[PDB]
């Protein structure tokens, strides 16, 4: 005769993968921007 | 996160577009160089004849 709650904790899981889903998009993004710049010159 | 992925999609879209434009120009130039090659062949024949 009593009753219980529950809680959450965010675990390295996100400490890494979610921060990586910023760093690893913008950085591959940096590679893609470089590609785009080179293609622009090539097309010219 | 999503914004960067969208920007990268846009980047690759423009990238493909520019690549295709470049290729169109190259194909016209090669065909056009072939046409001018044929003309120069006619020139070459005429010059040979004039030598004779």
Swiss-Prot record, chain A:
Organism equals Saccharomyces cerevisiae (strain ATCC 204508 / S288c)
What is the name of this protein? Protein SSO1
What else does the entry mention about this protein? Present with 450 molecules/cell in log phase SD medium.
Stated role: Required for vesicle fusion with the plasma membrane.
Q: Where in the cell is it found?
A: Membrane
Gene name, Swiss-Prot/TrEMBL? SSO1
Give the family per the record: Belongs to the syntaxin family.
From Swiss-Prot, chain B:
t-SNARE coiled-coil homology domain: residues covered: 2-52
Q: How does it assemble?
A: Interacts with SRO7 and SRO77.
Tell me the function of this protein.
Component of a SNARE complex that may be the effector of SEC4 function in exocytosis.
Q: What family is this?
A: Belongs to the SNAP-25 family.
Which protein are we looking at?
Protein transport protein SEC9
Source species of the chain: Saccharomyces cerevisiae (strain ATCC 204508 / S288c) (Baker's yeast)
| Full protein stretch here | 433 to 484 of 651
């Amino acid at each position: 005769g009593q009753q219980i709650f529950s809680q959450a904790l965010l675990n390295a899981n996100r400490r890494g993968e979610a921060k990586t889903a910023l760093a690893e998009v913008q950085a591959r993004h940096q590679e893609l921007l470089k590609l785009e710049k080179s293609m622009a010159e090539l097309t010219q | 996160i999503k914004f960067t992925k969208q920007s990268s999609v846009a980047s690759t879209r423009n990238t493909l577009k520019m690549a295709q434009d470049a290729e169109r120009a190259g194909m016209n130039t090669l065909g056009m160089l072939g046409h001018q090659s044929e003309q120069l062949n006619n020139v070459e024949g005429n010059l040979d004849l004039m030598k004779v």
